Structure formats: C-alpha cells, structure tokens
Symmetry: D2
Subunit: 321 residues, 4 copies
C-alpha cells in the first residue's frame, strides 16, 4: 500500500491510497450516512454524527473501511503493517479501547481536526479483536490527515503506540515510520536537476537523456523503496491549481509507485498488486477511484441525498485473485 | 518517452506511449480522414487512402503526429533519440526518400502489416529536412507495430539505418536499441518471487513486506532505466481479457514508468515529464489518453463519420 | 569506518577496522604496557593491569586509541557515530562515570570476556568530557569483541545507552545499530548464486558474466550501504584455516568496503577516506595494519618485552590530509 | 577480472589486474628471460627479444601469461570475454596469424609503445587454436598499456576485430568495450561531493554520514558494475607521489572492486573470486602481488640476474578451488 496526502494553495486536501493485496476482498465504495448505528466492542454504542465515504466491506451492517473520509475533510487510511503491528490481547481498563478495525469510524466520527485526534490518542488502546470470529485481525498501521496536517499511528511490540507527524505526506508498509524517515537521509544524493557532460580521466562521459540526477531512486515494490520514491515525488511535485489538476497530480504519483500485477509473487504463490487507487477531494466531497482491470476514473460523492440516507449506500463490488 | 505494445489472446493490439517533454507543443488528438491531401518533399504528392488517429499538431494543414495508428491496426510512435539520430543531408537517388517527419504517414498510409513495412524500409532513406524552415528536425527513433509483431527503426551516425524485431514490446530513448537489449542481461537477478527469511551469520534477516525479489529495479527516469523496468513489467504482466482490462493493464504499465513532474529538471531549467499517456486499441479503433493535469480517460474513435470527413478533426486539451 | 570480527574454527579471533576520516591525526601503533599510569576523570587514578596494542595518539602520556586489544584477547573499536552519539553533560552519582574517551582502556584493562563487560556496563555512565580543553569530544559508538561474542555499545539522545548482540560481526557509522539490522531485511533479494538465461516475452535475456545474483548490492560509502555490503560479505565468506588465510580474509572484506580517496568530499571541503585498515589476531597477539599510501602489511606484537616496557612504545606516526 | 592502469606525474606506469576465476590454475609468477625459445604456431619460431614478468602457467616450457609486462614498460592483460570472443577457424593468408594465447608474448616481445602495437595490429589475425589439444581456447579480450596510453583489443562475432583507446584506464568482462563506455553516461549523477541537509515538504532530511553523493554506485560483481565503479574510482583518485604511494593507490582501487569469496557462486556451483591482485611498476621493474589467502604484498623484479637467465624463472604456484 501507499498512502498520499497534499493540499493546493487554497487548503483543499487530496488524500488516498493504493491498496496492494494478494487475494480477493470484494471491496467497494460505501457511504455511511449520518445517524447510522455505530456499535463498539468496548466503548458505549452510539450512532454516526458525520457522513463518511470510502472503500471497504460490510459485515452485519457495519461498514469496515480500508480508507474513509468524513464530510468535514478528515480521513484515515489503514495500510498493511505485517511483521510489526501488535495489538493488545484484551482491553486495558482506563484506556479508550478500540478493536483495531474500529479506529476508522472512531477517528472520522469524533473529530474534524488532526490536532484533536492527536490529543485523544494519548489515552487510546488498540485491541487484537476482529469484527467477528470468522475474520482474522488485519496487521495495519494508519495515516490520518486533514487539510492542515497528517499523522501516522503505529502500535507494535517494539515501540508500543507511537504517533508521528507526517510532513512528508506519505506512508507505505513495514517497518515503522521512524525507520523510513531515517532512511531518507541515505537518499539525499537524489537531485531533480540533470547532470551535465563530464570528463573521466579525459574520456568524455555525457548523459544520454534526461533524469540522470535521480540515479539510485529504487523502482521495486519493497515498502522502504516505495516510501523513498513516494516521498521524493511528493516533495518535488509543484503545486497544482484546480480540482482536475490536483486529482491528476495525485493519481500521477500513486500510479508511479503502484505494485504492478505479475511483478510480485508472494511466498504463497499469489500475485500481490495494486487492486485500486483512490483519492478523496475534501473540496468537492468526491471519492475518485480506478482499479487494476478498469482504468476509468469513477466518482462517488457526499451530498444532501447520500449523507442523509437511512441505509448504507453500497456500490458495485470489485473482485480479483 | 516510453512506447509499449502487447496483444491479448484474441489478437487485439494495445499500442501507445508516454510523451515525456520539457515544453508545450500544443498537441491534441488529430483524426486524418481518407482522401486527405498528402504532400511529400521527395515523392509525388498524393492523398490519404487510410484514416489515421493519434496525437500531434497541424502545420499548414499537415498533421504531424507524435504517434498515430491507421484504421487497419498498424501504428507508429516517434520517440526522442538525442545524441544518436542522424538523417541524410539530402535525398539519395534510387531510394524512397522521406524527410524524417514523413515516416509517420508513409507507414500508416501505405501498409497494413509490419512485414510489408520491413521489406519496403530496405530502400527507404530518411532525410534531415524539417517540415518547414520554422521547425527543427526532431532527433527521433520509431516503434512500429501491428497485431503480429513490432519493429524498431533507428538511423544513427554510429550504425546507419537499423531495423530490429522488438519481442520485448517496449522502447524508450537513447542510446541505441541493441545497447538496451544488451543491458537486460545485467538485470537477470530480478525475480518476481519474494525472498524468504534467512540467517546471516546466525542473525535472523527476513523481508518486511512483499517485493523483495526485484531488488535493484531502477525507478528513475534515465532512458536505460525506464527501458529495464518497462521491459520487466511487460514480460511478467499476465494476459488480460477484454477491452477494459487490457486498456487498464496498458495504462498500469505506462503510468508506472511515467516521468513525474518536478522530478526531472533539464539543463535548460525546465521540468521534463509525461505530458500524456495514450493507447490505441486496434480492436475498437479507439485512441485512449489522459494528461498530466487531467487524469480522466478520454476516448476518440475512428468510425464511419470521422474516417470519411472532408476536414482534419482535432480535439483539444 | 567499518569494524569487522570473525573467528576461525579453533576459536582464534580476527578483529579490527577501517578508519575513515577527513583530517590528520598523525596516528600510529601504540603498545601500552602493564604497570603504566592510568588516570580517570571520575574514578580513582590507577595503573594498567594488562598490556594493550592498537592504533591511536598520545596526549600528555595518555594513549588515546581508535581501536585497541588486550593481551587476553578482548578488544574494542570506536567508530564515528555523528548526529546520534550523546553523552551526559556531567557525571551521575552512583554510576561508574567514564569520559567517553576512557571506555577504550576501561574495557581493555578490567575485563577478559564480553560477558563481564555487558554486566559491568549496566552501571556505567558515559560523560561528554574531553581529555583536555584543547580537544573535542568525538561522537563515537563501539564494537567490543572477544573470541566468543561481540557487542555494540551506543549511547544516544534517542535511545539512551543500548547494548546489542552483534552476530553479524560488523559495524559502520550512523544511524543506530537496530536501524541497520532492520535495513538488512530489504536486501533479502541478494543471492550469491548466479542467475541463468531467461526469456522476457520471448526475447532471450542471459547474464554476460558472473555476479548477477547480487544485483542491488550498493557500492558507495554511505554508512548504511557499507553496513549492508560488509554484513553480506561476512555472512557468505567461508571459514578460513590458519593465520595467513584468516588475516587475508579479513583484509579482503575490509578493503572491499574501503572509502576510496577522491570518491568522497565532505561538506567542509575535505577528502574522507580509509586512512588505514588494521586487524588484531588474538591467537598471535599481533596487530596487522596498512595505510592508504603504503600498502605493505606491517606487524606489531605483544610479547614479554613490549608488555613489560616502562614506557609507551609508539611506532611511526602516519600523517595525512 | 578488473584491469587498471594509471601513471604518476613523472611518467611511471602502474598497471595490473585482479584475476577472478572459478577453478584452479596453480598460477605463479614467471620471469621469461632474454634469448629464451619462443615458438609460434603460424610464424617462424624465434627467441625472446626482451625479458618479461607476470603471472601465468608453464606448458611444455612455454610461459602462458594471464598478464605480463616487458622490461621496456609495455604490458598486456588478458581478461575473460565470454559470449563475445571469437577467433578465426585456422590462419588467414596474408595476415600475421597468432593463436589467441600467443598475443601475450607477441605484444610484449616485439614492441615498446602502444602506438606501434596499434599499427602492427592492423594486419594481425587471431586464430581459435589452443596451446595444445589438452587445453580449451580461452575467450579473452585484452588491455595493453605503456606510460603514454592504453588500448583495448576485442575480437568478437558481433564486431570483428576492434581496437579502442582506453582513457578511462580500466577493463572488466563482457559485454564489449563500447557498451561499457556508453553505460557510463547513465552514471553521470554520481558526485564525490556529499549532499547537504534538505527539506522534503518541510520535513528536515539530512545525511547520516559521508558518501551521499555517490548514491547508486553499484557494489556487486557483474562486469558492467565493476567497470562503472573502477572507472569512477580511477577518474577521481588524485595523483600519488612515489613508488609506495602509487602501488598503494593501485591496490586500494583494485581491492575495492575485488570479487569476494563466497559472494559469487556460478551455475556450476563453484565460487568465483579474486584469487590475486597484481601490479607492475614500470619505474621499478617490479611485479607486486597478493592472494586471496595470503595478503602479504610480495615483490618480484626484472634485474640483471633475472633478465639474463638461461632458463625460465618460476616462483611458487598458488592453488585454490
């Protein structure tokens, strides 16, 4: 997975992710409206206060999101974090206890600013509890963003719960976020500016085409390598103006770091690849997506009809693997 | 630039390119209909016999294509080939003489199969002659493809005119095609299969996520590096079924190797990037494209109306 | 800097380092004998109880070692750890307080086994105090080894004092040791075994020469990259038999990862390069070394004459930069 | 294999190679004296015009060199060139015909300057014939150097006989020399100067250590990769003064690009590695070498006693594999 966020000069947020998986989930766009039942495994049951859009599955009427965004412009994406994610065996008294899947709606229902999320997370404990006994707990970490800032949330055996500022605007997979941030110092030799003709011991040596300054940028799908490239692209991509250009910029970056079908075969023998790329535009309350086998940009919107539905609105399910 | 071609299991061709440039050409989709006037600098002027679609600019009523495709499913893309491309100073008696820009319509107007093109090229001489005094001659090389095979055409000071089979289905920029083919042998260590946990002197070392077998795959935009990655992705992407899935596969590969705005600044100080990605589907006669600043997939079609137009038709972006 | 240790099948230790620097030190081999004055900033002054050999400089009769090894087979090398090393502003009551430079002789004078060092370090505090006001405090971390095991010692603002088992046998420079260990998982695609001929879409693609399995092994001098390469070479270098073959194996690995003069210019404008490579062989009590401008392998030995000297034995000083 | 040549400011040549192989040869230093029998397959037999030193084997009194250097300062090294090298089926009328193994002594016996070698090579034909029927024909290419210049000689099925100027001072293995020269343009992003602290989307990103400018320099043993690295190191290594410093500079570069034992296993299951590194110093008429299992720098010299011997002079044979 790769998560990405950035804004335009007007404070409009473009935020979303590639989902990179090696099996089917039947994922689809879900709109969760206001006043919808919101049970919790450890907290009091309540109802939704905000409409939410994103991609996920529905289990017994509960929308379990891979990534989702509220009508106020605050979103969250859960990305794979294997060999690292570790949640508590049971709830911890005194904490706000959430089964790990519940963080998606807890963040998007209760807050409009990442600043509020950061403060509340100081007393949150994530529990190794699945939606029901027929599912396994997904090893995930999260990127959360509004138009002002983004944070990363990781819970591990090594470090416990950590919350990091994410000025880079990106996230991938394992290992932990500080490891990846530290890794960027090893790529400071990257330069967008092309090299020029040189003399190596008197032998003329000159570029054959543009791009020579980024020698060493990795193009494989190892999470550390996609992190470096996504951070580098986001750091150097100029500001875009308008909805079309910012959505395009977003898909340009995420499609650059997509995991391409056939290029990764896991130890189980299955293809791992980017099954979808999705972008939420806070300015237009529109969720854009395309899929590995259908490149058409589909759009889904939070509006006065969808936000006030009495039922979940579910769209066509995408199948693969 | 990156050119790409592949077919499905039913013989439908998907063929197109990224255009990676550092200036605006004011390009758009041009449909050249049948019976349109077609001048030649060194041949008898004539008219088009086949309709053609693609991306380019119109210069004094001449459609100058970056890449274009005829109604019979034969196409050609011209990609930058600096420090290498060299064409004749003037026409050479006894040869079919073409100004280099004229190869685009010469190929798409006179042939339906690459086999015919390969034979006719044996007596073609490309000439260093611009469309008019107001334009420079573009240093280009070409990929030409139908549903059966693709060829690469390069004319260089170093090697003269060369025509290669292109089983890999890809082309980028300089150096020459044989140089790139030879480079692939240095990347035989790439493997789509993930690595497994290991012991380094007793220290457990294990992957943190998937993708470990492709360690060393380059992700920068140097032409040699886009060539390796595009070739590797095309070699390992399984067959796709149907128009939607094949167009998506095509765009998945080309967007992976796109040159991203802001990540390349040339020595003249300008950003170089993938301004558009375009795919021609021979089976639907449809040219798909999106642009750096508009990701929506746009479609333009050779149909009985557009193919029989009395005008050039252009669609702007 | 790159530190390296390994043993043969008879328990003989080969341990040493490349010193990679950008300024002159006039360094040379120093034998510190038994019964030599040993002052401490925060402990009772004493005398040496064990003879030590290594490379260093002499400051008012105090031998300050870059790396050193005692007559009982226990050694330590201090390697640069910039942007990370952090020692306490002053001594801490109740701790064994050592100015950071004092760890070299504290370790080699008081112990013969790493197991003892590990236990004693539980109550050690390293202080940011130079040998005198005319010297800066070097930001260092250390590898310590006997014939049974090696440890890494790092003290940082990020993590405080950490002591790691170093099964890999290597150490370089920043960042911290756990970061480098974690980085190795990103290089699991490396394989000593050569690739074979392949078909890419029907195009024959075959190796042009041997070595194809290690595609992606980095050859620059960034510390993370030398760590990966040194760890990989040591992991795959077979056992060697006898003194000459083990010393050669050692120099083969370290010279492979040397920082080559002219290839690195630091931001202060100075060339940084491997000024020397050195190996202590515990089995022969011999320190082997060569230098960037003199490749001859020189030997210096702890014996009954040198170990019982009344004076420091200082061999020729090596000037550079 | 990697070949390297450079000079000091006084016109003294340092020229030699790493021998990287996957089988035993029992190689050793051989001095071929003046007036020694010199048979040719396709030319009249003669005697040696001058003394030569280098590394090789002796076959029925014929010294067959991996690399060799005459007393007048001209040398040649034969390096593996598989999948390319192709010599003629039998001699060709009107040419100076040499079995490919005969070029080593043909060049070093008949010439002092590369300019004269190049002119003579215009009528030379290399023949696919072994020293006797018990040996295969080695698929070699050659680097030839004096103090003024170096050339590469390649005879391939792809290109026929080609002679290239070698300002870079290096040679490795396949593919052909022009391919490698062309490859260097793809590495123009390399810069000895370290990067500086940067801001990636407002996130401070700074080097952890020196060497960041050479991001992307490959460290594996694929021939193209050793060629890039060897060329880059030679291009940037400053001038050295005197015999010791220049010999050290030479060994520093070649040991940096050595093929390390255990890190390359060929498809036949055998280790490929640098069995020796050797350097001829024209100014001292001395051949320096060390070996994978004996790092001592040994010296062998062309002098009044060795150049005038009535018999071939051989030194100890080095076995491996």
């Amino acid at each position: 997975c790769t998560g990405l966020r950035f804004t335009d000069e007007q404070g409009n947020l473009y935020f979303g992710r590639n989902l990179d998986v090696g099996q089917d989930y039947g994922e689809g766009v879900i709109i969760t409206p206001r006043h919808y039942p919101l049970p919790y495994k450890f907290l009091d049951n309540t109802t939704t206060k905000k409409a939410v859009i994103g991609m996920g599955i529905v289990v017994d009427g509960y929308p379990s999101y891979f990534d989702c965004y509220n009508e106020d412009g605050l979103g969250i994406a859960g990305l794979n974090f294997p060999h690292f994610a570790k949640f508590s065996d049971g709830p911890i008294d005194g904490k706000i206890n959430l089964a790990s899947y519940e963080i998606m709606l807890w963040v998007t229902q209760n807050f409009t600013h990442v600043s509020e999320v950061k403060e509340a997370l100081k007393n949150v404990n994530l529990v190794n509890e699945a939606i029901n006994s027929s599912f396994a707990v997904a090893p995930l970490h999260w990127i959360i963003s509004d138009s002002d800032e983004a944070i990363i949330v990781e819970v591990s055996k090594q470090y416990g719960m950590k919350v990091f500022e994410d000025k880079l605007g990106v996230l991938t997979n394992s290992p932990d976020f500080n490891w990846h941030l530290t890794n960027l110092g090893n790529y400071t030799g990257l330069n967008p500016h092309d090299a020029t003709a040189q003399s190596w011991n008197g032998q003329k040596v000159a570029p054959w085409g543009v791009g020579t300054g980024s020698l060493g940028l990795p193009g494989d799908s190892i999470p550390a390598d996609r992190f470096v490239k996504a951070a580098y692209l986001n750091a150097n991509y100029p500001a875009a103006k308008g909805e079309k250009a910012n959505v395009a910029k977003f898909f340009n970056i995420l499609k650059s770091v997509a995991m391409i079908k056939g290029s990764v075969v896991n130890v189980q023998g299955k293809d791992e690849y980017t099954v979808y790329t999705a972008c939420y535009s806070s300015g237009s309350k529109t969720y854009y997506c395309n899929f590995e086998d259908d490149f058409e940009l589909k759009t889904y919107k939070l509006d006065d009809k969808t936000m006030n539905s009495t039922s979940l609105i579910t769209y066509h399910h995408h199948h693969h693997h």
